[PDB]
């Protein structure tokens with residue numbers, strides 16, 4: 001999971 | 005396009 | 009093999025599947041979550057959820073145009089997860105995390121359940 | 133928005149769509165290319181090809197279960213492109229490049245046409  |  | 013790969017292809021396919029959903033093009037099922045209805049493509053639902061994969065590989069249920077979810081399922085939690093299925097983006101907030109996690113557990117979406125557990129553990 | 137994103141989601145969706153295609157699950161059209169037939173999902177074809185997007189948004193053609201391609205279309209070229217649609221991987225070879233490019237032009241798959249033009253220009 002990432003900060004897009 | 006890339007070499008996968 | 010000696011194939012070349014187009015990095016953005018999968019993302020572009022999903023963007024187009026979401027555009028088709030927004031315009032209600034070739035949607036083949038309506039998911040009913042208490043008073044709310046959500047139109048979708050069975051193949052995308054199966055590709056994202058262990059529960060839908062089981063439902064639509066069933067010889068009788070594969071032919072249904074309406075699927076009714078358990079009455080304990082929260083429509084907003086379902087909406088957030090349906091958006092995630094079509095975009096890879098999860099709108100996870102303090103006010104919805106419990107509903108999102110409970111819905112992801114029911115839908116059998118392990119990666120969502122995992123990030124919800126991690127975000128909850130960080131706040132305790 | 134304040135969304136989080138699952139990097140592998142789009143790739144995992146496409147992998148599952150390909151698994152459904154391989155098992156002939158919820159495929160809703162057969163593409164006929166001279167003596168050959170290819171089963172697929174209309175939504176994936178539309179999401180990858182300008183030609184299929186046009187065909188399946190047509191009020192009459194959207195309901196067809198069989199689509200016959202132009203007799204000049206090479207089945208192997210079509211097979212390579214159908215595999216690309218479901219995997220992001222293009223099996224581009226000296227022996228098939230002309231057929232692949234001609235099929236990608238007909239199917240309106242601009243990124244494939246682009247890499248074919250580049251590979252051809254490099255060999256001249």
Ligand SMILES: N#Cc1c(Cl)ncnc1Nc1ccc2c(c1)CC(=O)N2
Pocket residue numbers: 051054055056057058059061116117118119148149151152
């Ligand atoms: N459509 C399809 C499909 C196929 Cl073909 N093969 C394998 N899994 C499929 N989908 C599916 C099954 C289980 C789970 C998910 C997706 C996400 C998750 O957390 N559990």
Ligand SMILES: N#Cc1c(Cl)ncnc1Nc1ccc2c(c1)CC(=O)N2
Pocket residue numbers: 024025027028175178179180181182183185240241242243
């Ligand atoms: N399905 C869908 C779709 C939608 Cl909804 N919106 C916009 N394009 C869509 N698909 C589509 C249209 C034109 C082309 C491609 C795909 C690849 C290419 O080279 N040309």
Ligand SMILES: [Cl-]
Pocket residue numbers: 071072073074
């Ligand atoms: Cl029904």
Ligand SMILES: [Cl-]
Pocket residue numbers: 056117118119120
């Ligand atoms: Cl997931």
Ligand SMILES: [Cl-]
Pocket residue numbers: 195196197198
């Ligand atoms: Cl027909």
Ligand SMILES: [Cl-]
Pocket residue numbers: 180241242243244
């Ligand atoms: Cl393309």
